[PDB]
Amino acid sequence: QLNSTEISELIKQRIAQFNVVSEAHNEGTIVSVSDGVIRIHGLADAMQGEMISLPGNRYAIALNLERDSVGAVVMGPYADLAEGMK
Amino acid sequence: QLNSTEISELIKQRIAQFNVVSEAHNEGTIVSVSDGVIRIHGLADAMQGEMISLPGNRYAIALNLERDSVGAVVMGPYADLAEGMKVKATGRILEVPVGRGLLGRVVNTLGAPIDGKGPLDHDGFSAVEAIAPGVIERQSVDQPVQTGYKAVDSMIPIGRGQRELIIGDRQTGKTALAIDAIINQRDSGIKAIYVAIGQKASTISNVVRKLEEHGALANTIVVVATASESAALQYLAPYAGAAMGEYFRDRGEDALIIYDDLSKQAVAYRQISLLLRRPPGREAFPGDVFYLHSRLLERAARVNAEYVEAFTKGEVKGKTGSLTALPIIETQAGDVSAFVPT
Amino acid sequence: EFITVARPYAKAAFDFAVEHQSVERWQDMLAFAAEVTKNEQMAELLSGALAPETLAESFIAVAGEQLDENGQNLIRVMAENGRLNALPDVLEQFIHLRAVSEATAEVDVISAAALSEQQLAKISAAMEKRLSRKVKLNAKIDKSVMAGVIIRAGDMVIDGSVRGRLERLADVL
Amino acid sequence: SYEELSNSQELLETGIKVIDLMAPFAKGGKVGLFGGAGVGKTVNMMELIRNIAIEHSGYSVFAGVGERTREGNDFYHEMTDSNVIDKVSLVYGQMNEPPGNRLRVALTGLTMAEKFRDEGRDVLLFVDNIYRYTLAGTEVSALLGRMPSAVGYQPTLAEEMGVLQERITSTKTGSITSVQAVYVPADDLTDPSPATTFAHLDATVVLSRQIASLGIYPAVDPLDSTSRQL
Amino acid sequence: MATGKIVQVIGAVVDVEFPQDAVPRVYDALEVQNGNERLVLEVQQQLGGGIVRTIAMGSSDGLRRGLDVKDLEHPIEVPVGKATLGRIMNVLGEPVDMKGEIGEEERWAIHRAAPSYEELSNSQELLETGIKVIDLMAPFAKGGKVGLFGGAGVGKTVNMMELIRNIAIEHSGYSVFAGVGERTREGNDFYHEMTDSNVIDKVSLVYGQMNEPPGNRLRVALTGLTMAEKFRDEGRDVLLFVDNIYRYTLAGTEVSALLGRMPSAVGYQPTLAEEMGVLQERITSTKTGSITSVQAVYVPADDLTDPSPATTFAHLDATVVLSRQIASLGIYPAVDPLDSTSRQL
Ligand SMILES: Nc1ncnc2c1ncn2[C@@H]1O[C@H](COP(=O)(O)OP(=O)(O)OP(=O)(O)O)[C@@H](O)[C@H]1O
Ligand SMILES: Nc1ncnc2c1ncn2[C@@H]1O[C@H](COP(=O)(O)OP(=O)(O)OP(=O)(O)O)[C@@H](O)[C@H]1O
Ligand SMILES: Nc1ncnc2c1ncn2[C@@H]1O[C@H](COP(=O)(O)OP(=O)(O)O)[C@@H](O)[C@H]1O
Numbered sequence A: 001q002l003n004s005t006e007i008s009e010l011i012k013q014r015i016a017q018f019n020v021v022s023e024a025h026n027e028g029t030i031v032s033v034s035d036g037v038i039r040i041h042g043l044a045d046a047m048q049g050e051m052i053s054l055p056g057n058r059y060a061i062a063l064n065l066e067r068d069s070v071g072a073v074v075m076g077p078y079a080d081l082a083e084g085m086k
Numbered sequence B: 001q002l003n004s005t006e007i008s009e010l011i012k013q014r015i016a017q018f019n020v021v022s023e024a025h026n027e028g029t030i031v032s033v034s035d036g037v038i039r040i041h042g043l044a045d046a047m048q049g050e051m052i053s054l055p056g057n058r059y060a061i062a063l064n065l066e067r068d069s070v071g072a073v074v075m076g077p078y079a080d081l082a083e084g085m086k087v088k089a090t091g092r093i094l095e096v097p098v099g100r101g102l103l104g105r106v107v108n109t110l111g112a113p114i115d116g117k118g119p120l121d122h123d124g125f126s127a128v129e130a131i132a133p134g135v136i137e138r139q140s141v142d143q144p145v146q147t148g149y150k151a152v153d154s155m156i157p158i159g160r161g162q163r164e165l166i167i168g169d170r171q172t173g174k175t176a177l178a179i180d181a182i183i184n185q186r187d188s189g190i191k192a193i194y195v196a197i198g199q200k201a202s203t204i205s206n207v208v209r210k211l212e213e214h215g216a217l218a219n220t221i222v223v224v225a226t227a228s229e230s231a232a233l234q235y236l237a238p239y240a241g242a243a244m245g246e247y248f249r250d251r252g253e254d255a256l257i258i259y260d261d262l263s264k265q266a267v268a269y270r271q272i273s274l275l276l277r278r279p280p281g282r283e284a285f286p287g288d289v290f291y292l293h294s295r296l297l298e299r300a301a302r303v304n305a306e307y308v309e310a311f312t313k314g315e316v317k318g319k320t321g322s323l324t325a326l327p328i329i330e331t332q333a334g335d336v337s338a339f340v341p342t
Numbered sequence C: 001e002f003i004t005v006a007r008p009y010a011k012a013a014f015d016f017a018v019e020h021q022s023v024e025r026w027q028d029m030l031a032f033a034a035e036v037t038k039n040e041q042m043a044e045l046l047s048g049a050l051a052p053e054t055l056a057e058s059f060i061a062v063a064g065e066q067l068d069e070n071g072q073n074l075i076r077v078m079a080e081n082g083r084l085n086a087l088p089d090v091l092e093q094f095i096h097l098r099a100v101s102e103a104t105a106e107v108d109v110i111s112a113a114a115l116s117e118q119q120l121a122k123i124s125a126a127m128e129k130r131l132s133r134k135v136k137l138n139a140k141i142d143k144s145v146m147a148g149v150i151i152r153a154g155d156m157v158i159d160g161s162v163r164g165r166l167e168r169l170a171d172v173l
Numbered sequence D: 001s002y003e004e005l006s007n008s009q010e011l012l013e014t015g016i017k018v019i020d021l022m023a024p025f026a027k028g029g030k031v032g033l034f035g036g037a038g039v040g041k042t043v044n045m046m047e048l049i050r051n052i053a054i055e056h057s058g059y060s061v062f063a064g065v066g067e068r069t070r071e072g073n074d075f076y077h078e079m080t081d082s083n084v085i086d087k088v089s090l091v092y093g094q095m096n097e098p099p100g101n102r103l104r105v106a107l108t109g110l111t112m113a114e115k116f117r118d119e120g121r122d123v124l125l126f127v128d129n130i131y132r133y134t135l136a137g138t139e140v141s142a143l144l145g146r147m148p149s150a151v152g153y154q155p156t157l158a159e160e161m162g163v164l165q166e167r168i169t170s171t172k173t174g175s176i177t178s179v180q181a182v183y184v185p186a187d188d189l190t191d192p193s194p195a196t197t198f199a200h201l202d203a204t205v206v207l208s209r210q211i212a213s214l215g216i217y218p219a220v221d222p223l224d225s226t227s228r229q230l
Numbered sequence E: 001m002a003t004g005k006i007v008q009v010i011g012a013v014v015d016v017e018f019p020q021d022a023v024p025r026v027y028d029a030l031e032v033q034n035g036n037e038r039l040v041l042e043v044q045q046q047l048g049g050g051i052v053r054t055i056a057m058g059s060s061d062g063l064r065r066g067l068d069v070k071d072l073e074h075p076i077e078v079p080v081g082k083a084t085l086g087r088i089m090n091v092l093g094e095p096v097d098m099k100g101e102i103g104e105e106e107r108w109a110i111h112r113a114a115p116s117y118e119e120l121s122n123s124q125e126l127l128e129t130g131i132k133v134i135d136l137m138a139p140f141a142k143g144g145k146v147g148l149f150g151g152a153g154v155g156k157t158v159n160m161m162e163l164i165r166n167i168a169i170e171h172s173g174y175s176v177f178a179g180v181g182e183r184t185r186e187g188n189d190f191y192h193e194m195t196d197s198n199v200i201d202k203v204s205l206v207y208g209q210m211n212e213p214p215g216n217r218l219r220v221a222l223t224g225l226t227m228a229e230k231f232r233d234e235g236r237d238v239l240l241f242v243d244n245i246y247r248y249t250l251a252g253t254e255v256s257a258l259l260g261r262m263p264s265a266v267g268y269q270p271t272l273a274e275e276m277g278v279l280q281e282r283i284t285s286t287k288t289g290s291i292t293s294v295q296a297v298y299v300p301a302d303d304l305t306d307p308s309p310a311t312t313f314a315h316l317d318a319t320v321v322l323s324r325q326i327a328s329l330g331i332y333p334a335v336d337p338l339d340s341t342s343r344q345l
C-alpha cells in the first residue's frame, strides 16, 4: 500500500532510530588478522601505497584496496592486533 | 558465487521454524551420493572419526565435519544408496576382531572371513586407530629376526621391533622376499601378518597357495583389500593389520607384519581427500600423507616388560613384546625423489 | 551478481507464502526488505565482517512491520549464509514466480507513434491467443522503429518495425 | 569372490618365439601388450589370434574400445572370409564416438565374456585398447566437478581401473583368457595409467620404438618383458 | 566459564567461534574436553567476526561440533629452569618420564621476540671436537650454530652422539636436547645412554615424536629453545642440540595446507623463510649469556637445492655436509671437505 518514496523515508527513519551508522571515510576497523597481513573494513578514502596508522605507534601499508576491505601489511610485530581495532 | 546444499524443501522447513526442534542429534539424511563419498545433513552429535550406520548393514567414516554438513566415505558398495535415506551415528570408532584364532585365516579389512573356512574364533575386538607406546615404554632392539637370505641376514640385519623398508620397481622380487621372510618364521616363534593393499585377488590366492604348500600358513594371518574394494577399505586395511599385530605385542609375544604396497594405500587416501575437496599438495597428494604412514609405522615397537605387566594386569611377567614391520614401496623407474618414497 | 543464489530463497519463500495464501503480504514484506538494503548507511554495514547474529538483529530492529515467525526468520537464514544483498534479486524472482503461478504476463509494446486504444485492444487479444497467460500491455514510445510495432514479451520478441525489415533486407544482398 | 577363484600352471603355447620363451602365458590368465603409438601391439594380437585359435575350440569375445573403425572392419571381413566368425562375438565403441560410449563399451564386453564363462565354458577375451577407457574417464572427470590429480588425471583412477580389472577373471565354473592392448602416452612407461596397469597382469610384453626402428620385429624388449609363469 | 563453540573439525585444524567482544589473540591457547581427555588448541588466525582458526595439540578423534571451548588468555607456557634437568617433557611441558610432577617455580611462554641488535655479542673462542675432519675443515667456536646437513642414513645421529659425548662431558654446564620428529626408539636409546653415562642430571629433554599430531611437532622446538633461553638469561653457557630442524618446516607445510594459505614453490608454505628466521634468530649468544647450538637438517633426496635446505644454510656459523656418496663407499664420517666449512677457519 505504501509508495517507494514513503518506504524510503521510513527506512531512513528507522535506521536512524536504531543507530546503524556508517564509517568516516578516513577510518576503519580490522576484521581479520593472519600471518602479518590484516584486513580492514572502511577507509573509503585510503589510497594505494598509503601508510595506515595502528595502535601502539605501529605502521602498516595499504596494498590491496578492495571493494569491501583494505588488505594491509604490518611493519613490525603483528601478533598484538585483533579483529575490531580501529 | 555458489550454493552450499541450501535447497528448497530444507529452506522451507527452516522458514516454518528457524530454531528447529532438538529432535534427535543422533541421526540425519543423505543429501548427495558420488564416487563412494556421501554428504549428510544433520548428525549434530557425530564425532570426527566415528562410524555412521547406513541402510542395510553398511557403514561410513565421518571425515569432514563442516558447517551443517558431514562428509563420509562408504566402506563398501555405495552405488545402491540414495538421497533422502536416513542414517544414524553410532558411538563407535572402527574396531576389528582380534585374537589367536585368526592365525591361518584370510580376512577382509573388517575382519570378516573371506576364505570360506567358517566363522572366526577371535578374542574380542580392538580399535583400528590407536596410539603407539611412549618413549619410556620402549626397549632397545637386540634379538634377531632371521630372514633366511644370505645377503640380508649378513649385511642388512633386521631385529625384533625394527621397521625395514623394502623398495624397488615393479617385478623386482619385493613380494617374494617378504613372503619368504614369512616362511622362515614357520618354526621361529614369531607370528606373521601379511596385509595386501590394492592387489588383484588371484595374486593373493597364489601367494596363499605357496604359503600353504610350505607350513607357513598355519602361522600367519592374511588381510586382503583387493583392487575392486572401495578406497576407504584399502586406506584402512594397514591399520587393521597393525591392530592385529599389537595384540601379540601387548601380551609379550613377537609378531612380524608385512605391509604390502604402502604406496597403494597413499593413492587411496589421496582419492578420499580429493573427493572430499581438501587442499591438494605435491603430486596432488594430501598434505597429511606423512602423518598417515608415520602413525602407522611407529606402532612397530619393542615394549619393556613393565609395560607388558601393566597392560596384561600382571598376568604375564618379565617378557618383552615386539612388532616388526616390513613395508613395501614401488618406485617409478627408481626415482627416490618422489614424495611417498622420500 | 546474485541471480543464481537468489533462486532457492525465492522458491522456498513463495511455496511457504502459498501454503498460507498471504502471497501479496509476503511480497510487501520482501519489498520492505529490499529497500532497506539500498540505504547508504545500511549498505556500509552489510559489507562489514560482523558476526551473523549481531548483524541480523540490527537489521531486524530496523526491519519493523514484518512477521516475527516467518519473514524475520527468512532474514535469519539469509544472514547465516551472508546473503542479505540477494534481497533485491530474491524480490524480482518472487514476483516472477507469482506471475507464473497467477498465469499472468507483462509485455512491452514499442513504436515511434503513440498507439491508439483499438490497436492495443487487438494486440492484447492476439497475445492472449499466443500466450496462455493474461497480458498487461506496457506502452513505450521510441522513434527507432520509424514505423510499425515492436512486440516484446520478455525474451520472446516479434519485430514489426520498418527499420527491422530494412536492415534485414540489407543483408540479403 | 576370492573363494570362487582358480589357478592353473598349464602352458598355453603361442607361436611367437619371443613371447613364449621370455614370458610364458598360461590358460585362464591375463596378458598385456604395452607400447607407444605405432609399435605393433595390434598386429601382435592378430598373430596371437591366429596361433591361439589353432588349439582353442570354444567361443571368444572382442571389445573394440576407442580405436580405428578400419581395423575393426578389416578384422570382421577376415573373420567372415575364413568362416571363423561363427564363434566370435564383437562389441564396437570406436574412437569417433562421444565419451560415454567409449567409457561404457568395455563394461559391456565384459558382461558377454562373463556369460560365456558362467555357462562353464572357456572364453577368449580381446580388448582393443584399455588405455582409452581410463582416458574417457579423464575427459569426463573435470566436467563432473572433481579436482585434478597427478598429471591432470581423475582422482579415482586406480579404483576405476581396479573395479573393471577384478571381474575379468577365472572361476571354479569357467575361465576367461584375455589379451589387452595397453597404449602408453608419449612413450612414457612411468605414466600413472600404464604404471597401474602393470600390476593387474600375469604376462606383460613391453614393445619399444628403438627396436622397431632397427627393423627388428616383433619389437619385444627382452629386458623388460616378464611373466609370472617363468 | 567456557565462551566458545567448535564449528568445524578438519584434521588437525579446529574452528572455534566466540562472542565478538572476547576473541582470543593469535598464538593464544584454548582448552576443550575431548571425551574424557583435555585437549589444548593454539590460535593461528583471526578470521571474520568471532571465529579463530586453531591447531590441535593432540589427537583430533572424538571432537564434535558444538563442544564448548575455553579461552586461556595467554600463549602456551612451559616450566623452565633447574626443575627441568633430568626430565623428559612433551610440547606442553607435561612430564612423560613417569617420575611425577615437574615442581617448577616459573613458567615462560614459548612465543617471544629475538634479542635486540644492541644485545648481541662477538667472541671467537675455539672448541675442540676430537674428530679430525670436523676439527680440520670446520672448527667450532663457542656460541655459534653448527649444521649437520645430510640425507637419510649418512651419520647425522652418530655424529651428534659422538659430539654429545665429546663436548658435553667437558662442558661443565647445563644442556638442552630437543627431539623434533625423532624416532621413539632413538629417543629411548639416547635417554638410556645419558642415564648410563650418569650425565642425565645436567640435561633437559623435550620430545615430540613422529607419531604425534602436527601441532605437537611444530611447537616442540620452541619449547626446548625457551628452556635454553631461561638458562641463558640466568647468565650461563649452554648447549642446545636439535635433532632435526627439517620436520619443523615440514609440520609447518602440513599445517599450512589446511590453514588456507595459498601453496608455494615445491609445495612449501609461503611463510617458510619467515618461520625459519623466527626460530633461528632466537638461537644466539648475547652480552648476558651464550647458547651453543648443534642442529641436524634433513636434505630431501640429497638435493641440497630445494628451499628448506637452501634457507637454513644462511643462519649457521659452522656447516658440515655429510654426503651419501662417501658413506656408500664405506668411509665414516661422510663429511665432504669440498662443501663443508666454518666461518672460524
Ligand atoms: N630369489 C629369486 N630367484 C628367482 N626368482 C625370484 C627370486 N625372488 C623373486 N623371484 C621372481 O621374481 C618375480 C617377481 O616376484 P615379485 O612379485 O615378488 O616381485 P615384485 O618386485 O614384488 O613385483 P610387483 O610389485 O609387481 O608385485 C617372480 O617371477 C618370482 O618368482
Ligand atoms: N611383425 C611385423 N613386421 C613388420 N612390421 C610390423 C610387424 N608388426 C607390426 N609392424 C608394423 O607396425 C604397424 C602398425 O601395427 P599395429 O597396428 O599393431 O601398431 P600399434 O602400436 O598397435 O598402433 P596403434 O595404437 O596406432 O593402432 C604395421 O603397419 C607395420 O608397419
Ligand atoms: N662413524 C660411523 N661409523 C660407523 N657407522 C656409521 C657412522 N656414521 C654413520 N654410520 C651408519 O649410518 C647408519 C646410522 O646413521 P644415523 O646417523 O642413525 O642415520 P642419519 O644420518 O639418517 O641420522 C648405520 O648404518 C651406521 O652404521
Ligand SMILES: [Mg+2]
Pocket: B171, B173, B174, B175, B176
Ligand atoms: Mg610382487
Ligand SMILES: [Mg+2]
Pocket: D041, D042, D043, D071
Ligand atoms: Mg593398431
Ligand SMILES: [Mg+2]
Pocket: E156, E157
Ligand atoms: Mg636420525
